[PDB]
Amino acid sequence: MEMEKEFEQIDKSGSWAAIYQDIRHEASDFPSRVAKLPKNKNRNRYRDVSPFDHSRIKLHQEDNDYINASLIKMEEAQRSYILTQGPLPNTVGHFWEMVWEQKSRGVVMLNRVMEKGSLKCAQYWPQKEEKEMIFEDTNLKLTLISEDIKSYYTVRQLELENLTTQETREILHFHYTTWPDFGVPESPASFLNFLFKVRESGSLSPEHGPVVVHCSAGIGRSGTFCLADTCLLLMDKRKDPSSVDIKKVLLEMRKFRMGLIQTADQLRFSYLAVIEGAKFIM
Numbered sequence: 001m002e003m004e005k006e007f008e009q010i011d012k013s014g015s016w017a018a019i020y021q022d023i024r025h026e027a028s029d030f031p032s033r034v035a036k037l038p039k040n041k042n043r044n045r046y047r048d049v050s051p052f053d054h055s056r057i058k059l060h061q062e063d064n065d066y067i068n069a070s071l072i073k074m075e076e077a078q079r080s081y082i083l084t085q086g087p088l089p090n091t092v093g094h095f096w097e098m099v100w101e102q103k104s105r106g107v108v109m110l111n112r113v114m115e116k117g118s119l120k121c122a123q124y125w126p127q128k129e130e131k132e133m134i135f136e137d138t139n140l141k142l143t144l145i146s147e148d149i150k151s152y153y154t155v156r157q158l159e160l161e162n163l164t165t166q167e168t169r170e171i172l173h174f175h176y177t178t179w180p181d182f183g184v185p186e187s188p189a190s191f192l193n194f195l196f197k198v199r200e201s202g203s204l205s206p207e208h209g210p211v212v213v214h215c216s217a218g219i220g221r222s223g224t225f226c227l228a229d230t231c232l233l234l235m236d237k238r239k240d241p242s243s244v245d246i247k248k249v250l251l252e253m254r255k256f257r258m259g260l261i262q263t264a265d266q267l268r269f270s271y272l273a274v275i276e277g278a279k280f281i282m
């Protein structure tokens with residue numbers, strides 16, 4: 001079926017939970033043996049969210065190459081994304097090592113450091129120009145260059161230096177700051193505006209390594225971001241845009257990381273975002 005009318009048909013019939021459970025039942029199951037090794041317990045935020053072995057990002061290190069991160073490679077859309085958990089106190093150096101090694105231009109953050117009164121990720125970037133951060137375990141230096149605070153999101157320019165080679169690179173930090181503590185946004189307008197700002201920066205384009213996107217677990221809000229981006233790109237590429245099937249795209253993405261889209265409310269919000277976005281594109 002088309003999307004917008006499939007949408008009203010699920011609303012009128014109130015069957016979002018049944019649609020979402022079908023997706024959960026059909027989703028791929030692949031091994032995640034490296035994630036579950038005892039030496040990696042303090043590298044995982046949640047025991048039930050792990051990268052598959054076949055798609056995990058490897059650190060260029062011979063001691064321990066493990067990070068909780070996955071490469072989502074979308075062949076028809078010609079887009080790739082790295083989805084990862086919010087960094088932990090003992091993985092902030094690994095996080096920036098990955099950004100460096102994978103040649104990423106942009107980092108997309110969809111959570112606040114504290115939500116619901118609890119810490120959802122480490123404070124992994126500097127908050128003042130004159131107070132830079134050094135990660136001694138991976139030999140990187142990170143400096144805040146500029147910050148632009150808007151009503152729904154903040155964009156930061158960061159300098160990452162590989163202290164071993166003295167090479168430097170400019171990284172863009174795109175921080176969506178207004179996702180509610182509970183539920184999903186009432187309107188997708190600010191989320192879509194944010195997606196378009198990431199696109200306009202070049203951070204999603206083939207001349208750079210894959211964008212790094214995270215929330216707390218790296219599957220819920222993060223899944224919504226890449227699902228909406230890929231669906232809108234396919235609607236531009238195909239002769240028949242009504243042939244784009246958001247459930248089929250989501251199942252393709254779940255071949256590369258488990259659990260993408262965590263609730264039926266997040267599934268409905270993803271439909272809403274793609275529907276409204278397809279009108280603005282034209």
Ligand SMILES: O=C(c1ccc2c(c1)NNS2)N1CCOCC1
Pocket residue numbers: 188189190192193196276277278280281
């Ligand atoms: O999809 C977008 C969107 C936003 C910005 C741009 C765009 C498309 N295209 N160029 S810039 N929406 C969805 C409807 O409400 C808000 C805007």
